[PDB]
């Protein structure tokens, strides 16, 4: 396994848009700031 290995993880920030069901012009102006890490490592426990 040691012959082939990766280098590191990269972080990419994405955005989100509301549904196009509303015809109001104000719906295309606002943008909620949210996102998630790319290939992140999160543990569901902790060490004392």
């Amino acid at each position: 396994l040691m012959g082939d290995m990766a280098e590191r993880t990269t972080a990419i920030l994405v955005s989100s848009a509301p549904d196009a069901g509303a015809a109001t012009a104000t719906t295309r102006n606002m943008r909620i700031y949210d996102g998630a890490l790319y290939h992140g490592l999160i543990m569901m426990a902790y060490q004392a």
Binding site: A23, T24, A25, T27, R28
Partner: protein, 593 residues
């Protein structure tokens, strides 16, 4: 399709001035997804904006420009292809035909040049004006090469009509109504199209007839050229002679139109041209996957029409240039022989204005307006900051001089801003290399500066400078009535806070001695989207900084704290920037009656 057809009468009535040939060009709306605007406000919503589209030309080192073109169009959502291909049947709309998720469409007018001296090259960029937000308008710029590709699709259109006619025949035959006369005459017409094609083959043959664009927009670009026709006729003659040698030695919609008129009882403009072959001139690009389909009339001797013989080919303008370039193995014609230059001048009258080296310009960059305006704005901002810093350095007196409406319990912090003037000017100087340049590249300041220079150099031949509509209305006779104020915070960091400047009234009280400033307001009954920043009192945690400018490029400081400086930068711009840098500006932004 109705407004353009109505407006076609102006082009039809034209007899002279053949240098402007209007034609039907369809622009797909696939690129509207990246526009980021509301499609509802683009067709019919809250009338009063009066959105218009203008088409103008862009020359290179020759001068003059086209006097725009008053044209307009409207979009159509909800599967525009279905309602533009299938005839309109709104009273009896049902589940007719079958298609996938289509898109909208638009029609844009683009003049073309037709003459005995046709010629063709790629040196002109067509500028399109859109009445939308100047911030990221998402426009396009193409040369003349894509406008005239010298090609048409005449063979691929034959199979498209066959599928539609088969589908309509199947739909008519599927419903058992009317009488047997229609069925028998349809059967006779089908059998009349071939003896063994129907009796021994198939009548309709639905098999896998699906309405799709697979072989229609891929091949068929150059297929009906005179060389291709000659090759085809030679091949057919060869085949005929081969068949003759083998033999010698071995070892009509009149009834259909009447029935359609009786049944549908409705006409659409997209049906009269279906009886004649059409022309498709797609021009795609890697920016967006959407072909630029172009439809040309077949009943008129326009560009791409084939009704009397060979159409316009745009030839006899490339072989001579190629021969001249290959004669000395030099691509650049400037370093060619005198005979080659004389031949190029004689063959191309429009090319004689480049050899004489008139109206010098660095290289050939049609898109110079962007960075030209950027450089002009940078120079104006540097001159303004130099003037303000010099006046601050040479500012007499100290602290406040006039009254100023300041609360007794709030004056303890007003002097803090005034005492930090060196920090403020240092931050302003340093922010020139940190703040984004995409926020002040299309503001009202550059437009006002450009309109101010319109008074000087009113065309080399003259002109009254009388625009028709959609021009600089706030800047017509003077800038002392409408002001532009930018609000910035104090301290060691200055960043943009407001979005759109709001004019603020100002008047002087004292008619001499120590002048006093007291801003006022004017009641407006035409708009309600007005911010409350201008109406904010001077107190309530201090205020902002204002620097108004008149029509004479005179800046008056409105900084609170009894400090006011008046400096003029009208002569600094002329010294730093000569009169040779306004060439393209004068070429583009000029009009006369």
């Amino acid at each position: 399709m109705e407004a353009h057809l109505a407006n076609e009468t102006k082009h039809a009535l034209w007899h002279n001035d053949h240098t402007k040939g209007l034609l039907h060009v369809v622009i797909p709306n696939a690129g509207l997804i990246a526009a980021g605007i509301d499609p509802a406000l683009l067709i019919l919503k809250k009338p009063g904006q009066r959105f218009k589209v203008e088409v103008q030309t862009r020359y290179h080192a020759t001068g003059q420009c086209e006097p725009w073109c008053q044209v307009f169009a409207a979009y159509i959502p909800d599967n525009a292809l279905t309602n533009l291909l299938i005839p309109k049947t709104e009273p009896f709309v049902s589940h007719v035909f079958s298609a996938t998720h289509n898109s909208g469409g638009l029609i844009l007018s683009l003049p073309v040049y037709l003459s005995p001296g046709l010629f063709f090259d790629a040196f002109n960029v067509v500028a399109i004006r859109i009445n939308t937000g100047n911030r990221k308008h998402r426009d396009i710029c193409i040369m003349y090469a894509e406008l005239i590709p010298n090609g048409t699709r005449y063979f691929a259109d034959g199979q498209r009509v066959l599928l539609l006619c088969k589908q309509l025949i199947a739909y008519i035959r599927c419903t058992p109504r009317l009488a047997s006369s229609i069925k028998i005459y349809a059967e006779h017409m089908v059998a009349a199209m071939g003896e063994s094609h129907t009796s021994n083959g198939d009548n309709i043959g639905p098999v896998s007839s699906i309405i799709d664009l697979d072989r229609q927009l891929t091949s068929g670009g150059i297929d009906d050229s005179p060389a291709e026709t000659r090759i085809q006729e030679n091949n057919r003659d060869v085949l005929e002679l081969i068949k003759r040698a083998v033999n010698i030695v071995n070892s009509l919609m009149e009834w259909f139109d009447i029935c359609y008129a009786q049944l549908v009882s409705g006409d659409t403009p997209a049906d009269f041209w279906k009886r004649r072959p059409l022309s498709i001139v797609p021009r795609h690009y890697a920016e967006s996957p959407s072909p630029l389909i172009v439809v040309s009339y077949n009943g008129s001797s326009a560009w791409g029409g084939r009704i009397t013989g060979s159409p316009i080919l745009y030839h006899s303008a490339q072989a001579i240039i190629d021969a001249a370039c290959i004669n000395a193995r030099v691509d650049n014609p400037q370093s060619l022989h005198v005979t080659a230059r004389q031949e190029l001048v004689a063959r191309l009258p429009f090319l004689a204005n480049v050899l004489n080296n008139q109206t010098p310009l660095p290289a050939f960059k049609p898109g110079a307006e962007m960075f030209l305006n950027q450089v002009f704005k940078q120079a104006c901002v540097t001159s303004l900051t130099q003037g303000l810093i010099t006046e601050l350095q040479t500012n007499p007196t100290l602290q406040q001089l006039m009254e100023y409406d300041i609360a007794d319990s709030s004056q303890t912090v007003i002097d803090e801003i005034v005492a930090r003037t060196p920090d403020l000017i240092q931050t302003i100087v340093s922010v020139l290399t940190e703040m984004s340049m995409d926020a002040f590249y299309n503001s009202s300041l550059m437009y006002a500066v450009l309109a101010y220079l319109s008074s000087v150099y009113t065309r080399p031949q003259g002109g009254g400078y009388i625009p028709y509509l959609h021009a600089s209305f706030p800047c017509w006779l003077g800038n002392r009535s409408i002001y532009l104020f930018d609000y910035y915070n104090s301290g060691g960091e200055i960043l943009k806070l407001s979005k759109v400047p709001v004019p603020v009234a100002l008047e002087k009280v004292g008619i001499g001695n120590s002048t006093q400033l007291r801003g006022k307001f004017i009641r407006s009954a035409d708009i309600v989207d007005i911010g409350i920043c201008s109406k904010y009192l001077p107190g309530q945690c201090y205020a902002y900084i204002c620097l108004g400018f008149n029509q004479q490029l005179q800046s008056i400081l409105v900084l609170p704290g009894g400090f006011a400086a008046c400096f003029c930068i009208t002569d600094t711009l002329q010294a730093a920037l000569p009169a040779s840098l306004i060439g393209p500006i004068l070429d583009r932004f000029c009009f006369s009656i």
